[PDB]
Symmetry: D2
Subunit: 255 residues, 4 copies
């Protein structure tokens, strides 16, 4: 994986603990040119500070809230004018209301359910449509999911249904964009201590059950996700699309 002369858009860095910053450090270390998108002003500030650790000689930062079609459309169009065609997109974006990530899934509100779908699943479809315009000769799109999209995990509740939606999204996008030589895949990351992890009830209980029960008897980190992302975003994974790679110490393979 030399990724020199490649360009990747990484969506969803908030701080140094973000999964997407793991991805960024690995891709940066392999020589990629990187372009970052953020929602909150504070995330841009963190990005300007985190770019000091990377070898990127230019900050390419774009504010994109994926709840707005205009921002996604205009964001990518402007990325295209600033750096040209890209080779792929790492999508590391999700949200649900804290009200809905605990207690009873059956009490989820319509508004909470559709908010989680909108940000955590639909965003991939529209990002893919707009990113395709910058990948005339192909490339690779990777989204971040969690095992709670494949099995009902206590407390993950509405986000689980959104990740089920996301994972089907990857498959329908794979099928649709295949002929354009655009691969679409997911990484199913094991639990990692991030800012968004604080929203999920029982998160610490899960970290520790991974250590005791997963095959490798340890938890994974953001850089491990990043290394599999580099695989999925590079020519190493030619032939792989519509796939869900579990970066979770083997926890998916056990019961």
């Amino acid at each position: 994986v030399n990724l020199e002369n490649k360009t990747y858009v990484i969506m969803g860095i908030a701080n140094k603990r973000s999964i997407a910053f793991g991805v960024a450090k690995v891709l940066d270390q392999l020589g990629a040119k990187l372009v970052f998108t953020y929602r909150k002003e504070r995330s841009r500030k963190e990005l300007e500070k985190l770019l000091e650790q990377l070898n990127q000689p230019e900050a390419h930062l774009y504010q994109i809230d994926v709840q707005s079609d205009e921002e996604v459309i205009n964001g990518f169009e402007q990325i295209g004018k600033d750096v040209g065609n890209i080779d792929g997109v790492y999508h590391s974006i999700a949200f649900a209301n804290m009200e809905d990530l605990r207690g009873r899934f059956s009490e989820t509100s319509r508004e909470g359910f559709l908010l989680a779908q909108d940000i955590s699943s639909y965003s991939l479809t529209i990002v893919a449509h707009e990113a395709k315009k910058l990948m005339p000769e192909g490339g690779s799109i990777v989204a971040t999911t969690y095992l709670g999209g494949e099995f009902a995990v206590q407390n993950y509740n509405v986000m689980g249904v959104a990740k089920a939606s996301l994972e089907a999204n990857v498959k329908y996008l794979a099928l649709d964009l295949g002929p354009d030589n655009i691969r679409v895949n997911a990484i199913s990351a094991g639990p990692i201590r991030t800012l968004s992890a604080k929203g999920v009830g029982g998160f610490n209980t899960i970290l520790k059950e991974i250590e005791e029960r997963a095959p490798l008897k340890r938890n994974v980190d953001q850089v491990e996700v990043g290394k599999t992302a580099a695989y999925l975003l590079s020519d190493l994974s030619s032939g792989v699309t519509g796939e869900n790679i579990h970066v979770d110490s083997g926890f998916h393979a056990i019961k």
Copy 2:
């Protein structure tokens, strides 16, 4: 497998005699259940009043419920409860997506189209379950209808496939949540059946015929077949089964 006499089921989503849910109704009715029907469009009520002539139900229990409205789901079930009392389960046979999005390129799906399909085809189960639970104090069974395009990308099913993926996860999270209440939640993954909603899906006839040539039983299924598995899932025969997706599709799920 003796008998759904003294049982009461709510069947949601009959539009006409070709509806999957009318297969369910004919099987449950024939097994002695009391049945309660919910519909969105006035035309669906008219069809129901005519179809009830074929069933043995001595009383039409018809309730208008558009699952896009919380109020209608809340008030519909509350009124069902006042009219027939506690129920034993719910058959959910409801989905929708815009035709624009069921043939396009999936990557061109609109936000509004995507969320409409989630709202009607997935979220409706969650709120129906929450309101139906109140009429199942001693437990019961909820069954939703899905299709193989929620587990694999099937050409043309597009936005409805992502909605069925969402629905299938919905069944599992509901199973987990309502299990302690002795409410089982399951899905039937029906093979393609000629219905009014089938007309919305591009390439539907091509799929019917590939089932005949390739599925293990070399034939397609019908609405009554779905109904017989629904009776299993809604009865004590399936005690112990929850969070499950039963494929009623001539074995097509098992091949490649």
Copy 3:
């Protein structure tokens, strides 16, 4: 929920009153089926002659078949055919692995242990199906018993897990092959049940209790619950279902 009168089923693998297959037998018997039993060990026949006193079967049809022997399977079914005629289906409840291989380290499994488990626990279905087909000229249903350890690595299930993986693929390939003959083939994935064979699995009690705490219905299943799903799978209720794995396990398959 009608009737298995005028139907005939072969139930393979009753050893005692706690056998999963005796759950199946009590449900099918209660529904009016004629039943035919096969056993390996002389003690299993003795248990069967005593257990038949509880059933309504007016005639003991008992046949010794060790599924490691082609001759015994071929001659057993041929003789069943001469004694009761055509059958409607087969419940297969047979497995074995050496206790040496059901604990500690899967990587230390012996070739002989591995192939023994495949032979008895998987291949037996294929040859039983081939011989049973001859007694189902107009179609029928075959059901095998599996466990979640065939789909995921469960500690201590080790070699039997690979055998159940093999068995589950077996059901699918058999479904595809025998589908055109209108013979459906399916599996029940039973949750853990206190049986004589359960004693061979390390950590069995630990698993029973984790089901109670974590599975959706917060309780374990029993043999009769397996039997009720078997009646579904062996009857016309499940027309349209083949190549399927129904989990009778309090929903434990659906969680993580």
Copy 4:
């Protein structure tokens, strides 16, 4: 970079073998490679094919995986000759041609268990013996096909053997995880190899991939090799018990 790494590749018969794709990728990335073969003809092919790789020494070992002794003694000797290894690529399977067509229900006991023995059990014993040369961990990769997860017409007994293999990878993953040995599978799409000739309807499947798979094309041996390099390297730390489909997306569609 796989310099200073050593891998054992099991199951090259000729230049079209999946395992030779693996070899060309690992060789190109600087790995030291060790090869195992069954038939004398495969050794001859290997001595000729090694001329195309950059390996400065042929390390060839005869191992028929039906024999415990040959597996035990093969690996023990590999250890004495090159030292500790970093992983194993297993590309071995067999079933009788009689059983890879017509009716699966007519499969013989001997055919069924032969396919289990060579195509599934071989991984367990290879893993047990390879573990002894991976004191500080490593990676084991086996080759499977979609017919282990769904019933594919004509794949018949080999399908049940791949189902067994795939569960084998998961039980091995669980068991050897604590030893920092990862175990995974690659599910390769159809590739024109010597063993492909034994499967009825193989050409029909190649062409349906081109028309229906997402990428509208078939994969090749080098593509399998590139994902093997991922799985055998530190890039895939955190991944075990997994089945990666290198099949143009065909697994994701119905």
